[PDB]
Design a protein around this ligand. Structure first.
Ligand SMILES: Nc1ncnc2c1ncn2[C@@H]1O[C@H](CSCC[C@H](N)C(=O)O)[C@@H](O)[C@H]1O
Length: 350
DNA sequence: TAAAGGAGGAGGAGGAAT
DNA sequence: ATTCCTCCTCCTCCTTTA
C-alpha cells in the first residue's frame, strides 16, 4: 500500500532538512552489480508495487527534481547504492525562475505569482498560441492589470505549456538550448544530426535530470578510482552518461541500448565532442539484445559495474489519454527487458 | 513530404476545511 | 473518518501548413 512521500526529498536533498544516511537493504539485492532504475512517480495504481517486487522488493526513492533545478519533475528511483557521503554537482543550479531567466524579468508581469516551472514534457507550446495571448493583453496595456477573466486565461495557458515572457506581452515556450540547460545537459547537446525542433522536445521530455541523477551516483567516485563499466538500457540522449561525465568519473566501457537512431548519434556526438578515453558500443532494440552477446562483452571488458536505465513511461504517464494501461501497455512492458538483462549480469557477477 | 499545430480528460495528489 | 476545491501529468493522434 505504498504511498508518495511528502515532501519528495527521498533520502535527502541538498540544502533541505530530513536527510537519512543509512537504510536496511535486503540481502538478495546486494551487489555487485549496482543497478539504478528511474521512472515516473505518478503512475496508475499497483505499478510501483509490481516494479519494486521484480527488483528484489526494494522500496523506491521518490524525488521531486524541484529541489535541484527550476522545473518540477516528480520521479521514482530504485537502486542498491549507498546513501551516505553524497555530494552535488558544480556549478550550483538556478533554483528560481528569477535566476534561470534573467532577461525575462523585464517583461514578467507583477500579477504572475510563479517561482517554479512545471514538468518539461515532450510537447511544447505553439508559436501561434503566444500570438493569441499578445492580442489579448494588448488592449489593457495602458493599465497595470488586465481583467480577471483574461488573467485566468493566460495563467492557465502558461502553466500548461510552461511559457516564459521574452518580450512585451510575449509569452513564448522554452527553447531546446534552455531545456538542455535546465535538465543539466550542455547547450546544443541535441542540436546536431539535422534533428527537427519537434523531435528535440520529444527526446528531452523523455530524459533524466542530470543534477538529480548525478547526486545519487556521486557515491561511486571514490570507490571506483580507475573508472567504471556501464550498461545503460533505454539510454535516450545519455542522461546517465552526462551525469558521470560531470561527476569526473572515468568511463571505461559504455554499452548503450537505444532503438532510436537519432538518439544514438547524440550519444556518439557527446562521446567525440568530449574526447572521452573509454569505448562506446551502441545497440538498437533491447528485445534482440541476447544474453550470449551480453556475456560476450562481459568476459572481454571484465563485467559491468553499473546498470543504469529508465524504462518507457508512455503507458504510465498521466498525459496519455489514449493508452494508459500501466505495465500492460506496449511500451511500458519493456521494463521486464530491463529485469531480464539485469538478471543475466547478476548471474556472472556472483 | 517533413514539420508544426490543434483537439482531447482521466486520475490521483494535496490541500483546508469539517 | 468526511467532504469540496485546485492543481498537475517523461502524451496520442489527426489535421494543417510550408
Ligand atoms: N524496444 C526498445 N529497445 C531499446 N530502446 C527503446 C525501446 N523502446 C523505446 N526505447 C527508447 O527508450 C527511450 C525512452 S526511456 C529513455 C529515458 C531517457 N531518454 C534517458 O536518458 O534515460 C526512447 O528514447 C526510446 O528510443
Amino acid at each position: 500500500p505504498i504511498r508518495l512521500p511528502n515532501p519528495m526529498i527521498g533520502f535527502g536533498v541538498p540544502n533541505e532538512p530530513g536527510l537519512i544516511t543509512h537504510r536496511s537493504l535486503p540481502e538478495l539485492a546486494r551487489g555487485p552489480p549496482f543497478f539504478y532504475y528511474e521512472n515516473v512517480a505518478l503512475t496508475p495504481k499497483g505499478v510501483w508495487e509490481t516494479i519494486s517486487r521484480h527488483l528484489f522488493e526494494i522500496p523506491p526513492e521518490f524525488v521531486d527534481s524541484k529541489y535541484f533545478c527550476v522545473a518540477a519533475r516528480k520521479r521514482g528511483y530504485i537502486h542498491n547504492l549507498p546513501i551516505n557521503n553524497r555530494f552535488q554537482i558544480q556549478p550550483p543550479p538556478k533554483y528560481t525562475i528569477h535566476d534561470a531567466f534573467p532577461l525575462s524579468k523585464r517583461w514578467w508581469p507583477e500579477w504572475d505569482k510563479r517561482t517554479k516551472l512545471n514538468c518539461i514534457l515532450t510537447c511544447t507550446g505553439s508559436a501561434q498560441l503566444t500570438n493569441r495571448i499578445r492580442v489579448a493583453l494588448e488592449p489593457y496595456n495602458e493599465e497595470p492589470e488586465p481583467p480577471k477573466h483574461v488573467q485566468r486565461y493566460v495563467i492557465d495557458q502558461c502553466k500548461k505549456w510552461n511559457l516564459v515572457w521574452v518580450g512585451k506581452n510575449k509569452a513564448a515556450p522554452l527553447e531546446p538550448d534552455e531545456m538542455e540547460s535546465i535538465l543539466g545537459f550542455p547547450k546544443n547537446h541535441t542540436r546536431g544530426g539535422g534533428m527537427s525542433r519537434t523531435e528535440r522536445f520529444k527526446s528531452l521530455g523523455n530524459s533524466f535530470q542530470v543534477d538529480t541523477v548525478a547526486y545519487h551516483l556521486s557515491v561511486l567516485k571514490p570507490i571506483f578510482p580507475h573508472g567504471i563499466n556501464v550498461l545503460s538500457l533505454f539510454t535516450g540522449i545519455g542522461g546517465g552518461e552526462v551525469a558521470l561525465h560531470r561527476l569526473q568519473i572515468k568511463m571505461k566501457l559504455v554499452v548503450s541500448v537505444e532503438i532510436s537512431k537519432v538518439n544514438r548519434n547524440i550519444l556518439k556526438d557527446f562521446w567525440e565532442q568530449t574526447n572521452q578515453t573509454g569505448e562506446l558500443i551502441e545497440f538498437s532494440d533491447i528485445q534482440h539484445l541476447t544474453n550470449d552477446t551480453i556475456e560476450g562483452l562481459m568476459e572481454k571488458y571484465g563485467g559491468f559495474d553499473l546498470v543504469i536505465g529508465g524504462s518507457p513511461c508512455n503507458n504510465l504517464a498521466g498525459g496519455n489519454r489514449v493508452s494508459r494501461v500501466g505495465l500492460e501497455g506496449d511500451q511500458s512492458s519493456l521494463f521486464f527487458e530491463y529485469c531480464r538483462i539485469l538478471e543475466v549480469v547478476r548471474a556472472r557477477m556472483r
